[PDB]
């Protein structure tokens with residue numbers, strides 16, 4: 001039962017903890033609440049491998065400046081959660097990558113690209129754009145709706161896979 005450090009990254013309004021609450025107790029909150037530091041643990045069987053998920057929710061606001069390259073190193077897998085509602089959240093992911101790369105001390109890294117708010121008719125960015133960008137970094141793109149839990153399960157298992165494939 002291995003514990004993988006899973007940390008989510010994104011902006012305010014995307015719903016990073018939405019995926020976690022949907023997995024822990026399986027509940028979706030309507031009233032968006034800005035989270036600062038929350039830890040979620042649950043025993044899940046990954047492809048037959050019973051593991052313990054040690055997920056940590058990070059702040060979506062750029063408050064921490066000279067304090068990010070501290071706990072960001074302990075993070076194993078990062079969840080690039082963006083929203084198709086606003087392209088701003090899409091470009092925000094880029095900054096996180098640049099930061100993560102310096103913290104990982106390597107060019108390559110096992111990560112996944114997930115597009116939230118896929119169930120909303122407010123599509124500012126298209127699938128091809130996300131797929132195109134994902135192909136450059138060699139990361140898989142999965143559509144994820146936190147409103148009805150669409151693609152969340154798939155994305156979760158795919159992420160853990162990338163981590164295990166990276167080592168084994």
Ligand SMILES: CN(C)C(=O)c1cc2cccc(F)c2o1
Nearest residue numbers: 005006007039054055056074075
């Ligand atoms: C109960 N949890 C989540 C921890 O003690 C932990 C710490 C931590 C730091 C960076 C990234 C992570 F995923 C992390 O998990």
